[PDB]
Motif scaffolding. Sequence first.
Motif, PDB file in Angstrom:
ATOM      1  N   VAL A 170      -3.988 -13.277  -7.136  1.00  0.00           N
ATOM      2  CA  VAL A 170      -2.526 -13.503  -7.219  1.00  0.00           C
ATOM      3  C   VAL A 170      -2.073 -14.750  -6.455  1.00  0.00           C
ATOM      4  N   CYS A 171      -2.697 -15.038  -5.313  1.00  0.00           N
ATOM      5  CA  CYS A 171      -2.264 -16.092  -4.389  1.00  0.00           C
ATOM      6  C   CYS A 171      -2.803 -17.492  -4.735  1.00  0.00           C
ATOM      7  N   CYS A 185       0.772  -1.256   0.000  1.00  0.00           N
ATOM      8  CA  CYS A 185       0.000   0.000   0.000  1.00  0.00           C
ATOM      9  C   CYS A 185       0.814   1.324   0.000  1.00  0.00           C
ATOM     10  N   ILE A 225       1.743   1.458  -6.068  1.00  0.00           N
ATOM     11  CA  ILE A 225       0.778   0.489  -6.616  1.00  0.00           C
ATOM     12  C   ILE A 225       1.466  -0.880  -6.761  1.00  0.00           C
ATOM     13  N   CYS A 226       0.989  -1.871  -6.003  1.00  0.00           N
ATOM     14  CA  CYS A 226       1.783  -3.048  -5.651  1.00  0.00           C
ATOM     15  C   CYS A 226       1.978  -4.011  -6.832  1.00  0.00           C
ATOM     16  N   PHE A 239      -5.835 -17.172  -2.145  1.00  0.00           N
ATOM     17  CA  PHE A 239      -5.426 -16.577  -0.848  1.00  0.00           C
ATOM     18  C   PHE A 239      -5.843 -17.456   0.364  1.00  0.00           C
ATOM     19  N   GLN A 291      -4.097   3.473  -9.060  1.00  0.00           N
ATOM     20  CA  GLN A 291      -4.155   3.943  -7.669  1.00  0.00           C
ATOM     21  C   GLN A 291      -5.491   3.550  -6.995  1.00  0.00           C
ATOM     22  N   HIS A 292      -5.506   2.967  -5.792  1.00  0.00           N
ATOM     23  CA  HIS A 292      -4.395   2.362  -5.033  1.00  0.00           C
ATOM     24  C   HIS A 292      -4.958   1.294  -4.063  1.00  0.00           C
ATOM     25  N   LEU A 293      -4.091   0.444  -3.517  1.00  0.00           N
ATOM     26  CA  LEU A 293      -4.399  -0.528  -2.467  1.00  0.00           C
ATOM     27  C   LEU A 293      -4.525   0.169  -1.092  1.00  0.00           C
ATOM     28  N   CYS A 294      -5.291  -0.448  -0.185  1.00  0.00           N
ATOM     29  CA  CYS A 294      -5.722   0.056   1.129  1.00  0.00           C
ATOM     30  C   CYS A 294      -6.642   1.306   1.070  1.00  0.00           C
ATOM     31  N   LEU A 308       3.134  -7.748  -8.346  1.00  0.00           N
ATOM     32  CA  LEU A 308       2.765  -9.092  -7.880  1.00  0.00           C
ATOM     33  C   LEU A 308       3.865  -9.735  -7.009  1.00  0.00           C
ATOM     34  N   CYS A 332       0.953 -14.221  -0.045  1.00  0.00           N
ATOM     35  CA  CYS A 332       0.671 -15.567  -0.549  1.00  0.00           C
ATOM     36  C   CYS A 332       1.552 -16.632   0.138  1.00  0.00           C
ATOM     37  N   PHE A 373      -3.731  -2.226  -7.708  1.00  0.00           N
ATOM     38  CA  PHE A 373      -3.253  -3.458  -8.346  1.00  0.00           C
ATOM     39  C   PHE A 373      -2.802  -3.218  -9.799  1.00  0.00           C
ATOM     40  N   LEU A 411       3.001  -8.633  -3.541  1.00  0.00           N
ATOM     41  CA  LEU A 411       1.808  -9.369  -3.104  1.00  0.00           C
ATOM     42  C   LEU A 411       2.120 -10.825  -2.712  1.00  0.00           C
ATOM     43  N   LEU A 434      -6.781  -4.482  -1.848  1.00  0.00           N
ATOM     44  CA  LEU A 434      -5.674  -5.376  -1.475  1.00  0.00           C
ATOM     45  C   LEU A 434      -6.116  -6.847  -1.423  1.00  0.00           C
ATOM     46  N   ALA A 466      -6.861  -8.068  -5.088  1.00  0.00           N
ATOM     47  CA  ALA A 466      -5.579  -8.392  -5.705  1.00  0.00           C
ATOM     48  C   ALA A 466      -5.062  -9.757  -5.210  1.00  0.00           C
ATOM     49  N   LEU A 467      -5.056  -9.990  -3.893  1.00  0.00           N
ATOM     50  CA  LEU A 467      -4.537 -11.226  -3.300  1.00  0.00           C
ATOM     51  C   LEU A 467      -5.379 -12.464  -3.645  1.00  0.00           C
TER      52      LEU A 467
END
Lengths: 21, 30
Positions: B18-19, A7, A10-11, B25, B4-7, A13, A20, B1, A16, B11, B14-15
């Motif tokens: 991605v996870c 945060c 802009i994240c 996740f 603009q923007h995470l939080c 992967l 995970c 992700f 992230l 978040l 995105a997870l």
Amino acid sequence: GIVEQCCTSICSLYQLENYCN
Amino acid sequence: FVNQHLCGSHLVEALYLVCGERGXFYTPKT
């Protein structure tokens, strides 16, 4: 949830994948 | 992700994508 969260900018992967694994 | 923007939101969305090999996740419940 998670503590470090990214945060800042802009994240990507790669940032992230910390949440995970 | 991507924009603009995470939080305090985005978040987890995105997870969830991605996870894992099709996302996933982990999220606890009680």
